[PDB]
Design a protein around this ligand. Structure first.
Ligand code: NI
Ligand code: NI
Ligand code: NI
Ligand code: NI
Ligand code: NI
Ligand code: NI
Lengths: 100, 101, 566, 566, 566, 100
């Protein structure tokens, strides 16, 4: 595999998102770390699929709504940023006010 | 498209050109297999291999570097040898020369 | 005897005439020469050549090399050749034919009992990369860069502090001292840059005397004509380099005024295209000057479909800008220009831009300097074809021109080429071994000072080193004292003379920078073009000799999704 | 010109009169003062104030600070104020107005070329925490504590050995020597405690001469009147502190006998509530004495719905007790009392208990000292309202009273307040930067000796430091020699004089403890109450002046599920 | 008073007559002796025995031990006994009865204020293992081995280089010097092996003078009669050991010729069964000789259903062999033989093979030396029953015979038994504490030089050290200077005299090897059999005194799937 | 649990395979690291089940086909190797030319 430090680091993000994913499924209101991990992982898969940076900056704002997270959480996340390998290399996706 | 693929031009490579060679018939009289590497001083191989050791002095197998010739028990075969170059000084093996020649 | 060319390639690697594909790009290199005597190649293993009295001789340690890289395909600015590489005392001893003079002909690299062997048949070997635009935001950056194939890192910082987030500056004696001490803990060669933004020379001299090998002039600290002149005056007397990030706001003057302030003195211009910073919108015109050594940071390399979208936001968090403040955002469109971003790729292909760098965690990717440089070469080959300098049916020249961008040119620009930057005798043995299918992406072995410092390593408890999971892990060359012996901390001549190394009790080997004031654009290997370039103040169109310079954005790139898990 | 208060807060942080919510608690602080000159605030960035000739001057390094924290909201025992913080030579230089005297008014903290900048606008800055009840069970505890905001750790241990699992003691010269050496590898200031349980003074003197800054008297080694007297006699002559965990079994006497043995001599009582250990059921009555400096360990803080259930089991594995042995379990109900656990929270609110600590991995959570201290303040505000000392519509006094519990009071108790414990000039620059929404939970930056040692850090290969995943990673202040220069190893005066540092070849800076025998309850900042407290031997009810002291268990707490992944 | 045997075992561990099952194997040990005085056992904890004036005395540090392991069940080559273990100055002080002479009888190990305690009741304590076949392919191997219970590692390498992938050789002065420096960073005792394949003595002497404690003769470098004679001649004058991997190809002669070259001189034969390398197919006949110290590498131990299938491939990647080259593959069937693989297990049971080792990442598993040794003992008990030497209804003798294979015998073979290898007074305190259910699989505590270096550790932030997740983490004995004080770097006498330690500025304790030329098969503890063994050149059948020696392949083994997550 | 370094290291392999598993499910053509992780994890579970080394060396060649991975990937993986605890201890499984 020859995993570089950055690839291994992303495995940590992925696993954190698995945690959040199961909790959301149980019907729980997500907290701060769970929300960040869930949305971030969604963007990474988006890039793997070949979606554009422009598209993801938008789609990322419709992953979780204010009723799916704990009080104060939307305000604790003014934005979310994550990089991934798009077909045209690594790119940064910034999702502003992801939780409405 | 194959990542890192080679595009080797066809043909062959002549090995150890411009050097003396000789052919020797060798026979394994031992009861166990014996394999000889490309740069081993043929004259000092396992004593179980019977051949004209005198003719093989200062020679090694004329085979591509790193390969070898295997001699199963009782196996007889003719091999081609190529002379050592450089200082033509032999050290090691069975310790039969330990000096020039 | 005789052997077919294919079987030969499979056993000892390709030879004269054979071509090799670089990773999954469209670039093909062709072996220009082979220093071996056919049939006398050295190979290690059971029953192979490197054995007592055979390919290994009877010499004492002093008369043979410590390490030999057998059957390597060297790719360097000077040639693409097949040869054995000898390493002695942590430095390149010879490039030639290895073996035992006792029984083999033409041996120039003697192998004895004291010789370790690295089998490089089928692999490409290059010098270690050199990134001269490092923001020391976190120490983890060193491992990331080393893994990518970069062995020397020049830059400034004190850690995750606002000043460092934005500029490559290690402010003052105390922080410079502390970072030099911390440097002993990192597996890469290191040189620091001080804050050059001051109009009082003594404040700069103290920093140089403290240990920095250069001064960074950054607009966030005030890139004014006064500050620039001051920094250059000190640079000229202390033999250190000046890196520049000019006045984007055109607050103190336009590009012509900055150039006038420089007054023909030697200076390294960072991210010369401008997205990373600089006089909007024509800082790129600097590459036309003889005293300017121009480099690019990597996010704009190469021009792709997602480049622009991504930049508009990235340029906020770095320089501490407020999206709610009109003045902090209105200039974004003046700094991020499709016009200059597309031109930058061509300028590299022509040799007008001479260096590539990262701009680590401040609008740049530390582990992508090498990777992106090759993606540009690929994209340019695809769009423009063979270079005027090419000969034969290969991309050999384009390859030498681009590899020089992150190896020898950065070394020359910062006065460290006497120590690193290429595979030449006497230089530190900072080498990178690559499998052709992974060239420029994931190395097979990274050697520092003659000791492997990092490499992919499988299951530690396995019967062999290859079982999964295989990922990069630190080796002996990165451990304690062995690391100190295999890395260099670069100092200014004044610091070296003042006994700074002894004072701070630095444990690593020390090297001194020199020749920073005498290098010029003409000295950049294969990248010495001084184009008559202009930028339309309104359209932002770049022109060289009146012709429009531009390129098309890539939708897909090699060295990307086929190799990375994320 | 003029600017609205909201826009002002957004740009430079809150100012006089503005209130701020601490994390998700009900505690609100109000800026009591602002040391700036409106319009002359220093801000760093593109086109901002801190630039050559502007907010940055022409002075030499000796005449300006190495680091400046701009626009910080200081929360310390002495006040809650807005100001710039200057750091020079690894210590707090000044708290005031930063800038360039050449063009700005009232500048007390000069910024020059040698000055690094940390932007603290919108952030709260506090001194680093100090945990005086550390069991050195594993080295990993240091990173955990540093991440939470604790920069000094005092305790004892040799690793995961039975003696250490149960007591904070580093037994004898050899182990003391070994731990002092190991201490150089950790990014926190460290002081060790020896085993004080002996009735032969010389055995204790050797330990103090070896390097310990205190002696732990623990019942597991025999907390008898003879052992106690012996330890205190040595403490009085060598100027070191004694920490006590009394005789829970009432084997040698009751609490009054232990107090009698102490004989009015200065002593720090660990987990004074008793769940962590001590005379059942009235060890808590010790806080009434002038010579007793009382602290709490953190699992009982604050009283919640799950507290009791959890404790019955936790109290087994720590002290090597057998659940199958009646005598080893029957006393559990005598040690874990709802009555004293509920009272402890109120006693902290009144200032009767003066310190908070962990009791790391031996009935305590190393990363929760700060977090839990604030949860208690929240719970007390909710239950009891404003303190008699409060003024204004804020919780400013309650905040100063509680922050002192893990900063200045622990420092005073152990004789290290001349070096650390608060943000005052001359003290070591151990600072913690916090975003208000994460106050007391997850810091933005942890500074040790003037260098950032740990902070949240995003993707190393990213274009900026903010992309995910973001998690705490060691910075330059935690690397090799730089770490040695930014941390302190505390020694006893005898050890310092004996040349222990030179003998063991300790690389870190050395500090000597002093004033351990002269501190008393009256010296504890904002926590000097000596209540007339009693505990009913049968009901376990705690009373102060005859009134019953108690509180209700929390079902939900702030600084909990909203911030943690697990 | 009186106590039942079961309750006694539960409180203080088993006593004389009680039997204990080793992990999930069929092996049972029986306590042969107990050095305690019933009723006077020392136990630590609340209200327990080890307290001031009670089980702890009033002596000064010099008159008591630094560490005491209470109520341990010792399993060593000399006996299986119950006793307290005293450790002083990093070495084994005594094995006996601990306590306070003031009030207790028969105290031989005094406990005072300077004494730390490790509760070993219910645990088995053994010396640390010693692996003499290490390929230094990566530094991560040290932690893996330490976790398994191995505290000394002897071998050679420079990292992931072809020479090292195949042979245990650190080639020459420069690499030897670099590895000795790197060794200070690892938590295990270390000794290096040089490349012994040369026919010029001086080339070998330089390596010994540089610091190696032995020379590896490997066929990949040419295991010829000339090279062998040369290495042994140097070994005889410099008092260092020679490890041999003979000529598998029978290129220079058959096994009888190699034996003749050895000429009765002392030599350690690696992987004597032959799968790991050696004269095909009879290298195994070497164990019949008085001057040969024979060891096995671990992949063939013990013979299982999957052994053969797996080996055919493993033997390719190690020695750099080509599966496409007939000569490189045709011999696989001559090297991997079911006949000798089945016999090897019996030869160990009889004491003909005296050592077990790994052959780390070059046809061997670094973390499985101990584990596999016990699996063989289990399989032999199951197949052959009690040994002729057994007495009583236990496997005590078989246990002593097998534990010696990876402890005292390796120590004797390499001249380091004066320092390590067993639990005897004066030896370095390298000890391993085991829970009976996890014996030989996952240790409870690994002690190096008297300090715990690694152990399973739970949640760092937990109230106790036991909460999940529990996994091995480095302790204080593995940190910086403390580590240097608790580990040994072994040097040759010549290197020690030449001032090599001072020259390279080695920080760890130094030990010198001696007695490498005088050891012989008769000196191997419980494994001194010299069988009249023969191997049929055609069938490969192994015979001792004419009787066929063989065994059956296991389908399932203990110490496997019940303990490992993967 | 008392997880040794080798057990923890394998947790990384397992997680990498979870990534690939989900992507294959989405219908994507796997890249180099994803392919290696997916096949490797399959072998480890095979050993946990008690399958023989011989059986796995074969079965491992039928996990992914040339049409399920990106161009050039089969050529980048001449073989795959992984060790795991079989009922009879740790064994090495080598799968030659896993992707056909
Ligand atoms: Ni810039
Ligand atoms: Ni930059
Ligand atoms: Ni306690
Ligand atoms: Ni405690
Ligand atoms: Ni071998
Ligand atoms: Ni080996």
């Amino acid at each position: 595999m020859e995993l570089t430090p950055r690839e291994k680091d992303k495995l940590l993000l992925f696993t954190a998102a698995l945690v959040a994913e199961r909790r959301l499924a149980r019907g729980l209101k997500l907290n701060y770390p769970e929300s960040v991990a869930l949305i971030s992982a969604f963007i990474m898969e988006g890039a793997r699929d070949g979606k554009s940076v422009a598209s993801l900056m938008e789609e990322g704002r419709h992953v979780l709504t204010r009723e799916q997270v704990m009080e104060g959480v939307p305000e604790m996340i003014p934005d979310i940023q994550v990089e991934a390998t798009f077909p045209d290399g690594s790119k940064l996706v910034t999702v502003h006010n992801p939780i409405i | 498209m194959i990542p890192g693929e080679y595009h080797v031009k066809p043909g062959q490579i002549a090995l150890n050109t411009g050097r003396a060679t000789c052919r020797v018939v060798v026979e394994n009289h031992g009861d166990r297999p014996i394999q000889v590497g490309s740069h081993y001083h043929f004259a000092e191989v396992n004593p179980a291999l019977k051949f004209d050791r005198q003719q093989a002095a200062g020679y090694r197998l004329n085979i591509p570097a790193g390969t070898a010739v295997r001699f199963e028990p009782g196996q007889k075969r003719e091999v081609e040898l190529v002379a050592f170059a450089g200082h033509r000084a032999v050290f090691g093996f069975r310790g039969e020369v330990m000096g020039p020649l | 005897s005789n052997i077919s060319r294919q079987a030969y390639a499979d056993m000892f690697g390709p030879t004269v005439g054979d071509k090799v594909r670089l990773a999954d790009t469209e670039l093909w290199i062709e072996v220009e020469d082979d220093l071996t005597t056919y049939g006398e190649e050295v190979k290690f293993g059971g029953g192979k050549v490197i054995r007592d009295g055979m390919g290994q001789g009877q010499m004492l340690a002093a008369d043979c090399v410590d390490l030999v890289l057998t059957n390597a395909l060297i790719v360097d600015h000077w040639g693409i050749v097949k040869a054995d590489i000898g390493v002695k005392d942590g430095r390149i001893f010879a490039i030639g034919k290895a073996g035992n003079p006792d029984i083999q002909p033409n041996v120039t690299i003697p192998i004895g009992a004291a010789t370790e062997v690295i089998a490089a048949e089928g692999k490409i070997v290059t010098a270690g990369g050199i990134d001269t635009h490092i923001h020391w935001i976190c120490p983890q950056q060193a491992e990331e860069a080393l893994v990518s194939g970069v062995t020397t890192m020049v830059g400034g910082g004190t850690g995750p502090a606002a000043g460092t987030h934005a500029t490559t500056c290690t402010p003052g004696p105390w922080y410079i001292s502390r970072m030099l001490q911390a440097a002993d803990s990192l597996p890469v060669n290191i040189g620091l840059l001080g804050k050059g933004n001051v109009s009082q020379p003594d404040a700069l001299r103290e920093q140089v005397a403290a240990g920095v090998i250069g001064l960074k002039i950054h607009e966030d600290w005030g890139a004014t004509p006064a500050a620039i002149d001051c920094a250059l005056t000190v640079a000229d007397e202390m033999d250190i380099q000046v890196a520049l990030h000019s006045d984007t706001l055109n607050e103190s003057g336009f590009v012509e005024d900055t150039l006038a302030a420089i007054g023909g003195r030697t200076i390294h211009t960072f991210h010369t295209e401008g997205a990373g910073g600089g006089h909007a919108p024509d800082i790129i015109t600097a590459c036309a000057h003889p005293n300017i050594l121009p480099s690019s940071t990597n996010p704009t390399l190469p021009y792709t479909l997602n480049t622009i979208d991504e930049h508009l936001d990235m340029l906020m968090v770095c320089h501490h800008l407020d999206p709610d403040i009109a003045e902090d955002v209105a200039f974004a469109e003046s700094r991020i220009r499709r016009e200059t971003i597309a031109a930058e790729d061509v300028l590299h292909d022509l040799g007008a831009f001479s260096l590539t760098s990262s701009d680590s965690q401040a609008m740049g990717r530390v582990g992508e300097v090498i990777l992106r440089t090759w993606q540009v070469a690929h994209r340019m080959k695809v769009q423009r074809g063979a270079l005027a300098e090419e000969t034969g049916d290969n991309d050999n020249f384009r390859v030498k021109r681009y590899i020089a961008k992150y190896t020898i040119n950065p070394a020359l620009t910062h006065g460290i080429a006497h120590e690193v930057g290429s595979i030449e005798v006497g230089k530190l043995a900072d080498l990178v071994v690559w499998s052709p299918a992974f060239f420029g992406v994931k190395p097979a072995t990274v050697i520092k000072g003659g000791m492997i410092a990092i490499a992919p390593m499988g299951d530690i408890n396995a019967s062999i080193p290859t079982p999964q999971p295989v990922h990069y892990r630190p080796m002996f060359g990165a451990l304690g004292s062995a690391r100190h012996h295999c890395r260099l901390t670069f100092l200014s001549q004044a610091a070296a003379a003042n006994g700074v190394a002894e004072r701070l009790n630095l444990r690593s080997a020390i090297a001194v920078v020199k020749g920073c004031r005498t290098v010029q654009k003409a000295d950049m290997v294969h990248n010495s073009l001084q184009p008559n370039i202009t930028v339309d103040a309104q359209t932002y169109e770049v022109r060289v000799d009146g012709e429009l310079i531009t390129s098309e954005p890539a939708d897909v790139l090699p060295m990307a999704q086929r190799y990375f898990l994320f």
